[PDB]
Design a protein around this ligand. Structure first.
Ligand SMILES: *[C@@H]1O[C@H](CO)[C@@H](O[C@@H]2O[C@H](CO)[C@@H](O[C@H]3O[C@H](CO)[C@@H](O)[C@H](O)[C@@H]3O)[C@H](O)[C@H]2NC(C)=O)[C@H](O)[C@H]1NC(C)=O
Ligand SMILES: *[C@@H]1O[C@H](CO)[C@@H](O[C@@H]2O[C@H](CO)[C@@H](O)[C@H](O)[C@H]2NC(C)=O)[C@H](O)[C@H]1NC(C)=O
Ligand SMILES: *C/C=C(C)/C=C\C=C(C)\C=C\C1=C(C)CCCC1(C)C
Ligand SMILES: CCCCCCCS[C@@H]1O[C@H](CO)[C@@H](O)[C@H](O)[C@H]1O
Ligand SMILES: CCCCCCCCCCCCCCCC(=O)O
Ligand SMILES: *C(=O)CCCCCCCCCCCCCCC
Ligand SMILES: *C(=O)CCCCCCCCCCCCCCC
Ligand SMILES: [Hg+2]
Ligand SMILES: [Hg+2]
Ligand SMILES: [Hg+2]
Ligand SMILES: [Zn+2]
Ligand SMILES: [Zn+2]
Ligand SMILES: [Zn+2]
Ligand SMILES: [Zn+2]
Length: 348
């Protein structure tokens, strides 16, 4: 056999030399050099050091500035929360696991590791479909007098958690399951064994269709809409109104956010589909370690894109960080927001 299937795992390594050992019971240094696990460990460490501050700061700024209440300000607050669950929820176990070369906490640690990374990536995916819509509704504007209230935003946000849970929670209760991958320091869905006892093959198709192919289609199609309408070609103050102008900006970002997602998840999803379609073949531990661990940057790139592509949020952050105010920068030239400063309501 090309690998070592276990009742709970599947090491992508032969046991012809009987050197293979349950990744819930002993180090896996026979799969790779010990320094490489240190790499994973060092890496998970730096990611937690970046992901915590960046996501918490994002979260703190959004709340403190009483005017940051657009559908986008919501979706990104949602993402910051989901990213903090990633950091504390599973990254703590993946660093702990990398440090020992195996899942000392056994399947429980594997479930934390798998669930939160899944929950996180899937909340991002669904939050992108919501943006695609909102994006659409504003650009190609379907109604002749409609506007997303905060309620809607909270709707979309609530929706992303139902959809993400629909995919991440099943494996914790008998449908498919989380199992260690690559150097066995991370945990994902089961694409390795057909384990009928927990109905793995069906869940995998359920996830690639309901939680992937489909949301992608929506998002892409929706784009093919904001193709003839709002385009990447973004000019200066007023595009037909400085209003319309700054509309082109949010869309440019929602589009970058999509590219960042694919870069981050296509390789993983790709290796994952392969394995599913080539169960038992001869792949090694590094095969999935690389995209699996690279995809964990998904807990941080969202806020970066946001702060770099949103003059208003960046300013509210500089305003916040600069303890007092003095949003130096160039401000937003347009609206601003905060708590006691110029968070002065100014609609109509
Ligand atoms: C790869 O081949 C190895 C040799 O066949 C095999 O080693 C076997 O590992 C088990 C661990 O479950 C040992 O069983 C021990 O189980 C408990 C320990 O808590 C006790 O009842 C005894 O101490 C018992 O020995 C086997 O002794 C051991 N057999 C050997 C070394 O020949 C690996 O498990 C195989 N890799 C896999 C499939 O994970
Ligand atoms: C172990 O892995 C090897 C290589 O991945 C598998 O060999 C392949 O077998 C398929 C048919 O199942 C052929 O289409 C390929 O051409 C084979 N490639 C090679 C390298 O010979 C092998 O099947 C696997 N063994 C199992 C079933 O555990
Ligand atoms: C490091 C831990 C990881 C990557 C744990 C598991 C992640 C998954 C099972 C992710 C699945 C998918 C996502 C988030 C994005 C769309 C494609 C997908 C279904 C492969
Ligand atoms: C960017 C998406 C990545 C898509 C995943 C490609 C899986 S490709 C697969 O990898 C194996 C490694 O053990 C090779 O042995 C095999 O020849 C190759 O076809
Ligand atoms: C089109 C691209 C959007 C891409 C954006 C950049 C935001 C990036 C952050 C990636 C996390 C890197 C972590 C280093 C840890 C060593
Ligand atoms: C105004 O004073 C100019 C901006 C300078 C602020 C320096 C930015 C340092 C970033 C550290 C913030 C970490 C957030 C805390 C998370 C717990
Ligand atoms: C509120 O306005 C304070 C700004 C918050 C960012 C923290 C800035 C730190 C100040 C610079 C410290 C220099 C480093 C010296 C190390 C010995
Ligand atoms: Hg769109
Ligand atoms: Hg990424
Ligand atoms: Hg602001
Ligand atoms: Zn079983
Ligand atoms: Zn989902
Ligand atoms: Zn199969
Ligand atoms: Zn500026």
């Amino acid at each position: 056999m090309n690998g070592t299937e276990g009742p709970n795992f599947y090491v992508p390594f032969s046991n012809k030399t009987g050197v293979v050992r349950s990744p819930f019971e002993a180090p896996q240094y026979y799969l790779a050099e010990p320094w490489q696990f240190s790499m994973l460990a060092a890496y998970m460490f730096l990611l937690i050091m970046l992901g915590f501050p960046i996501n918490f700061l994002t979260l703190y700024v959004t709340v403190q500035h009483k005017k940051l209440r657009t559908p986008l300000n919501y979706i990104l607050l949602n993402l910051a929360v989901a990213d903090l669950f990633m950091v504390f929820g599973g990254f703590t176990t993946t660093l702990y696991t990398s440090l020992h070369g195996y899942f000392v906490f056994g399947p429980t640690g594997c479930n934390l590791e798998g669930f939160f990374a899944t929950l996180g990536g899937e909340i991002a995916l669904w939050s992108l479909v919501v943006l695609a819509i909102e994006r659409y509704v504003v650009v190609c504007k379907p109604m002749s007098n409609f506007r997303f209230g905060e309620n809607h935003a909270i709707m979309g946000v609530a929706f992303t958690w139902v959809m993400a849970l629909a995919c991440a929670a099943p494996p914790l209760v008998g449908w498919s399951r989380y199992i260690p991958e690559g150097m066995q320091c991370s945990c994902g869905i089961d694409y390795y064994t057909p384990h009928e006892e927990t109905n793995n093959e069906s869940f995998v198709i359920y996830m690639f269709v309901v939680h992937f192919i489909i949301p992608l289609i929506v998002i892409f199609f929706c784009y093919g809409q904001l193709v003839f309408t709002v385009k990447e070609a973004a000019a200066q103050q007023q595009e037909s109104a400085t209003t319309q102008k700054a509309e082109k900006e949010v869309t440019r970002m929602v589009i970058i956010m999509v590219i960042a997602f694919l870069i981050c998840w296509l390789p993983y999803a790709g290796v994952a589909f392969y394995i599913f379609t080539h169960q038992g073949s001869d792949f090694g531990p590094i095969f999935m370690t690389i995209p699996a661990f690279f995809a964990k940057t998904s807990a941080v790139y969202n806020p970066v894109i946001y702060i770099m592509m949103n003059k208003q949020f960046r300013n509210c952050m500089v305003t916040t960080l600069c303890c007092g105010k003095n949003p130096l920068g160039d401000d937003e030239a347009s609206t601003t927001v905060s708590k006691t400063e110029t968070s002065q309501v100014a609609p109509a």
